[PDB]
Amino acid sequence: FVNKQFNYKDPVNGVDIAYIKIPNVMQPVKAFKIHNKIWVIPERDTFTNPEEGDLNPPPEAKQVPVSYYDSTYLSTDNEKDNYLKGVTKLFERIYSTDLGRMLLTSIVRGIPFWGGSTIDTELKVIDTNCINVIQPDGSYRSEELNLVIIGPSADIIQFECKSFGHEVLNLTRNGYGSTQYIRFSPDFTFGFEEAGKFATDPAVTLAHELIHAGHRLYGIAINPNVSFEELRTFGGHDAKFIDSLQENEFRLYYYNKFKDIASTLNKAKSIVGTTASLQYMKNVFKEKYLLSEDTSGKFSVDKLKFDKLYKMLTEIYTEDNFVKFFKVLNRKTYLNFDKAVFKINIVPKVNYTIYDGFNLRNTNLAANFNGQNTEINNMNFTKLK
Ligand SMILES: CC(C)[C@H](NC(=O)[C@H](Cc1ccccc1)NS(=O)(=O)c1cc(Cl)cc(Cl)c1)C(=O)NO
Numbered sequence: 001f002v003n004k005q006f007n008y009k010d011p012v013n014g015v016d017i018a019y020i021k022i023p024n025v026m027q028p029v030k031a032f033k034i035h036n037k038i039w040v041i042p043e044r045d046t047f048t049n050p051e052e053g054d055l056n057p058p059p060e061a062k063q064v065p066v067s068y069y070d071s072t073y074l075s076t077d078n079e080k081d082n083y084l085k086g087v088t089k090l091f092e093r094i095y096s097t098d099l100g101r102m103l104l105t106s107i108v109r110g111i112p113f114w115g116g117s118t119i120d121t122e123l124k125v126i127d128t129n130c131i132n133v134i135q136p137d138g139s140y141r142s143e144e145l146n147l148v149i150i151g152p153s154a155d156i157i158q159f160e161c162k163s164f165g166h167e168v169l170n171l172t173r174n175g176y177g178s179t180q181y182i183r184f185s186p187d188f189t190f191g192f193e194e195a196g197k198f199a200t201d202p203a204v205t206l207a208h209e210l211i212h213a214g215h216r217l218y219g220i221a222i223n224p225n226v227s228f229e230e231l232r233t234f235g236g237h238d239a240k241f242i243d244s245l246q247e248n249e250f251r252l253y254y255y256n257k258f259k260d261i262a263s264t265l266n267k268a269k270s271i272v273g274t275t276a277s278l279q280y281m282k283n284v285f286k287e288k289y290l291l292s293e294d295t296s297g298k299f300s301v302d303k304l305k306f307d308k309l310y311k312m313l314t315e316i317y318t319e320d321n322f323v324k325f326f327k328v329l330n331r332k333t334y335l336n337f338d339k340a341v342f343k344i345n346i347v348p349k350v351n352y353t354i355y356d357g358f359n360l361r362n363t364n365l366a367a368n369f370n371g372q373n374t375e376i377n378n379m380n381f382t383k384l385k
């Protein structure tokens, strides 16, 4: 999924390893392009939210076990290189699963829609769904991306999937899509129970955020106002509490949104940019929104292809269905007050590996998830404050 092994020292080439500028909407950061439309910034997130980078503890913080605040984490290149080697490992772990592979494939193909012109006859990029890659002469070159994995802000364990919005457009909830930024650290993990029993496999924590970007990438995210959205996303049993006629009500709201995309494309006459033709980008979305193309060359939304895509995105792609595939132990519900944050290093193949995570085959750890047990495997889990 990441073809070439990256080191943080590896020289910039302005193609994959580059100094880049986030929409603000400031200074350039080293960032790696581990796959089409996926970039990884080994820095703390002091960029996405105007001056939310004091990066130093609040007046009174939640402490154990919800908030962690080290002002120094992800400052050393040695940590940044371990980070990228961290995140690259969880992606391949995720890719090794038939379901993570389909998911990233769903993430990579989910190009944020080109709905950036006030006109309705013209395709135009929404610069918020783009980064600025610095070229040799200091100048910047807009690149389109779907996903950025950047490290956390002040609270190190406050992992989330956020996105830049619009003056009028809800980009995650109108079928269009929006570049997704995932705050994440594979150098820490949350302990749960069912004495302090076990510990979350960071691939599960990562897979959770990729579910979320997926929903937002395809514009079928549920308004934040437990959230319905997190409920769809963790899956399992607690995904029955959802009024099915609030699920019907949405599975129809994002069909009529997908039909309004198909309209916008059919009515498109011009397009903006040097990059790509009106026809290249119409096939691009005709590939995203699995549209259908009659002889005239007018897109329609197939109610059947849309229903499998919506099913795959919303109820096939779930934390719960991920722990099936990962043969791991995970909180069976979203209400298991993780009563610790642990220090970890999943990079070494003796610590943790793509195929079995912490629960190493041919070891004591492969049974009753003894790899995940904070007691048995005390080396790999050091409780913090
Ligand atoms: C880190 C990540 C897993 C994240 N979860 C949180 O923010 C939870 C919120 C929450 C609320 C209710 C139940 C479960 C989770 N924060 S937390 O994971 O730090 C947490 C939750 C609880 Cl209930 C207690 C504690 Cl001490 C910490 C998330 O899902 N991003 O998409």
Ligand SMILES: [Zn+2]
Pocket: 208, 229, 230, 233
């Ligand atoms: Zn969630």
